[PDB]
Symmetry: D2
Subunit: 314 residues, 4 copies
């Protein structure tokens, strides 16, 4: 059968109602694949051979017991046909070291979703620099002076870190905010770290849309994430409310401009974030929102993904 | 003329007797290039255009005053013909973010020494995994159990981090050492970070040889670094004593097996570390030892480097 | 009744077989006290009044369910008669900030076990400086030069941090160890942090004895902790094997020399560590070993503690 | 003569125009004291005896060369009559460990300015809890829920950390600020660290007054620090503009209510911060502003301090 491996954060701590790695494993099992579970500490390199202690996994939609390990073994990763790299951000050096280990298996012919070299090339915030015609005004800098000047030009800005996801450290500096100085000292760590500033997009009130792309093809329904109450963050992670919608026509236009690059670079499962008609980030590590969209519409995103994996393995 | 830029750690704090970035700038000036100085905080991205505040530099071998800035300007980095990325390790995410900024200039046709994509692909310790036939026995793992077992098989091991240089955190765990447990808990941070173990190479007593490669071509004399007194580290940084030597015949054999890969990947200036006949690491960020070799032998390594840059620009 | 509060690490994550805070709560409940549970985040200060969100607790020796909250409330801490500060190390600034909050309640007449001012005065490693006649040779320094010289004088030394417990970072540097330099650079963080060196005590082979002192009175049986296998640490936390013993006559002599100071300073429940006839540290924050001693001998340490609390409240 | 020691941050890096430790050393030298210079790494403990490598210091108001060491020696600290602890914040555990070392010298009869036990008892922000009748409304908490509620009650609040000085991390959350959530997640590190909230005091527009107290006696002129431009921080450190003034009558009233406690606790040199008629913090580690006040008025604060030291030594 196909043997699929998954590197992910502890399965014992996921919420199977929302988790997309889990929805993918139910579909792989429904198709008859042998599932091999791994966490970051299980992978290693011995004389350049990527190997791992895996546990053969069995999953089921049961809220008392959703997984069971039916055996364990140490194998070379080149023994698996597909490895899904579903480790959550932050993008740190540990994450990078794991992609070199996954890359030694990929040279022995294992398919890696997503491709290790592209995970290091395409940072979720800075890859927008390759599509500046679709993004808001974006400045990446360490200097408070440049941040102050971008604020004076735009009046209302969003300042963010480059490594997190889920609304980690998002500040909005509107007109008359008394805190530009301390927010820049906090995000650049007194000018020793880069941060990103973007002009604020009022359309966030209509939702931050997560648009999913399966091997360059946009899935036709998205999830708009509406910030809630006293929150500047649309992220479900920061309490945002999700609303499944068909793609609007500027959603198709952005997703098709990016689609071919993602295919070309082996970024087989990608989550675009679109606010209004601007692209704000590209999630290539562990994008979610599969469950919410799939509940509301007749589309099997996990099926699309396994179909694309199986074509890639032919 | 050629306009060469350099991104480096503060020039006001270098030792011009030992520093190789400085020796390279004296040669570029001797050839008539216009030098533009940058530090990491000067580079930025505004709508995907890489730009920087540079300072036009003038250097001279004077220990009271070795540099002067004769002007400053904000320019797009694509205005320079060559940028030397000479920032010192650690390999951290800031270093990675800078390579995406240098990569936007490289797409507009600037030559980057070394190539930004290869700086992210070739970590100084883990790139040895692509030449395991030339390295010692090497294990990269988070698990103390695997480290203990590698120690029982080899008796005498070297344990190290993956990010530093200069002898940062090198432990030797010889037979009967009472500390394997606490050294593994310290380097893997209780199993949450990968570390590297290698079998100890007795030949370190004859020196850790720094072998320099200029665009795939090995420079014919090396510097052997001899550990001093009560030191397990050969590194000049950890007090090692340097001895310039001709390359021996296994030095030629290793350097030629790696030479073509480095050329192919745009790793134009590389420092190999060889102990005996084993490759232990590949320094691609800011390798030094140019001064010491050049003092003792009739070879101009900086000249070789500018000749290779000028060929690359043709 | 007496209302006793406890500040501790999450009760949902303790092992009731070994945990001493839990054994103390079963005894307080057996005596009829009302138990109020708190974690560090529940305590606060509003205009200098110490207050907390507590949860009224019910505990029982049941491995499926060992606690239940039967209500919650926000109260001033001065409403409780006794607060047991049982938060585990590290000794960090958060720990110190909590002692000022517990100190505002103590001025309104609540008994704090142990006394907040003494928790800040008596660091578990450096308080041994007030009894240097009972300790091994001890040097606290940031300088590798002094560490090297102490090693040359003593041949076999133990190097440790000042903040942890449980065998955190204990190195033994015996004769001919190739790592003094990197161990000193690691514990002093290149000379910016103090560490402690002590001469190694061969008697650790007979056990690191935990001697418990209840209001200056030594409990008459101790637990010797024997290091296991390839371990330099006797700590149960680092796999040490515990053996309950009567106190030997040098155990009585040390415990009585320290007894009156601990009483005097309101350090009502203290865990001395004795190796042979030398005192190595004084645990005043959350000392354990009550269960193991009590299983083997006819002594109720928790009873001694509640008797001392009740006398203190008279 | 009197031998005075000073523990301070590197003298080679101070600005003698503004630095108050330096102004104190010129006065001690003018009186004929022998000055012994120390940095944190020079102090150590060997079997509970506090000792240090000192350098005999000579200072002079010369901007090319303001200090010279005329010898060095290792001595027990009990050999000095007075040690000025002038190390700058942060208040971290290293700072605390140094106070135990200074405390072993103090038991052998050395005067420590300020007293080590009081430096650990009187944190610069939380010691205000002992004078809540003179401070603004102050909440110290880890819970965002309590911070949100304090903001709804007061409309305009100041949120700050407990460890820094100089305007480190001061946020103002006025009505309609879109960032309460991310500022609380940032200062409490997702609820794992305490932070302080206070209601905003409009009077900061007239200056944050530094009021100096020499052994319980208020010095009669203060320095008001006016925030500048786009700054919420009055601190000279964050660009604030200083204006020497006589004490107003509510400045006398606050300083006299605190004066006797500071004397009583051996906090011989203290810098109160007063905004309007509210006390906001008490700087006991390294308060400055001596130069600016002394330039404008006929008062020798350093003289007052040496007079108080000499009385303390009688
Ligand atoms: N330019 C913007 N305009 C408005 N809101 C933005 C903007 N950029 C980010 N945000 C807000 O911050 C949240 C997270 O931003 P995002 O770029 O997607 O980073 P993250 O990885 O944390 O999700 C968004 O959902 C939105 O609420
Ligand atoms: N396998 C080995 N055998 C012996 N010594 C080694 C070995 N690996 C590293 N070392 C020692 O540690 C020093 C640094 O090792 P290296 O791999 O080059 O890391 P770094 O980047 O810090 O220079 C070497 O100069 C040598 O002294
Ligand atoms: N002087 C010493 N001689 C021998 N072993 C020691 C010595 N000091 C510490 N140790 C070892 O390290 C372990 C922990 O040391 P300790 O001082 O008690 O710190 P901790 O708080 O981590 O328990 C001890 O149980 C013992 O095994
Ligand atoms: N309650 C307050 N009202 C207004 N401004 C305040 C208040 N508390 C602090 N600040 C501002 O922040 C600056 C620093 O606050 P402070 O409490 O003195 O901390 P620090 O140690 O950093 O000086 C003050 O100078 C002032 O500008
Ligand atoms: N691993 C998780 C996803 C974790 C996560 O937060 N992922 C980010 C991108 S890496 C995301 O898609 N967040 C969507 C949101 O917060 O709305 C899952 O599969 O559910
Ligand atoms: N930037 C410095 C080099 C800094 C450095 O230590 N570089 C490492 C590799 S990134 C090195 O070559 N070290 C040689 C040694 O310590 O012997 C220079 O040009 O001199
Ligand atoms: N809170 C825990 C104790 C946690 C702990 O490890 N405490 C240290 C001192 S703070 C200890 O006594 N350790 C004994 C050992 O490891 O043997 C309990 O009550 O069991
Ligand atoms: N050590 C320095 C003082 C460093 C410092 O910033 N101290 C703080 C208190 S610890 C201070 O008084 N700051 C006054 C201000 O920034 O206005 C000196 O003597 O000048
Ligand atoms: Mg994201
Ligand atoms: Mg997003
Ligand atoms: Mg190196
Ligand atoms: Mg090396
Ligand atoms: Mg302990
Ligand atoms: Mg101990
Ligand atoms: Mg202050
Ligand atoms: Mg202040």
């Amino acid at each position: 059968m196909i043997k699929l491996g998954i590197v992910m954060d502890p399965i014992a701590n996921i919420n199977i109602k929302k988790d997309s790695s889990f929805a993918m494993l139910l579909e792989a099992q429904r198709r008859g694949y042998e599932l091999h579970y791994m966490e970051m500490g299980d992978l290693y390199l011995i004389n350049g051979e990527a190997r791992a202690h895996t546990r053969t996994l069995n999953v089921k939609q049961n809220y008392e017991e959703w997984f069971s390990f039916v055996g364990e073994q140490d194998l070379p990763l080149a023994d698996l046909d597909v490895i899904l790299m579903r480790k959550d951000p932050p993008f740190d050096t540990e994450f990078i070291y794991a992609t070199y280990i996954l890359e030694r298996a990929e040279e022995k012919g294992t398919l890696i979703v997503n491709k290790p070299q592209s995970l290091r090339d395409c940072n979720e915030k800075l890859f927008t620099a390759w599509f500046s015609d679709l993004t808001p005004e974006t400045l990446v800098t360490r200097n408070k002076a440049q941040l102050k000047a971008f604020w004076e030009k735009h009046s209302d800005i969003i300042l963010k870190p480059l490594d997190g996801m889920g609304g980690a450290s998002i500040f909005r500096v509107k007109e008359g905010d008394p805190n530009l100085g301390v927010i820049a000292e906090t995000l650049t760590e007194h000018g020793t770290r880069y941060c990103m500033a973007q002009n604020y997009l009022p359309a966030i009130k209509d939702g931050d849309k997560r648009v999913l792309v399966v091997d360059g093809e946009p899935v036709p329904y998205c999830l708009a994430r509406i910030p809630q109450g006293g929150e500047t963050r649309g992220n479900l992670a920061a309490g945002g409310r999700g609303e499944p919608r068909p793609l609007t026509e500027s959603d198709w236009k952005i997703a098709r401009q990016i689609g071919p690059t993602l295919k070309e670079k082996g970024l087989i499962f990608v989550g675009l974030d679109i606010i209004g008609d601007r692209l704000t980030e590209i999630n290539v590590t562990s994008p979610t929102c599969i469950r919410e969209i799939e509940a509301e519409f007749p589309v099997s995103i996990t099926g699309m993904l396994m179909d694309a994996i199986e074509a890639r393995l032919q």
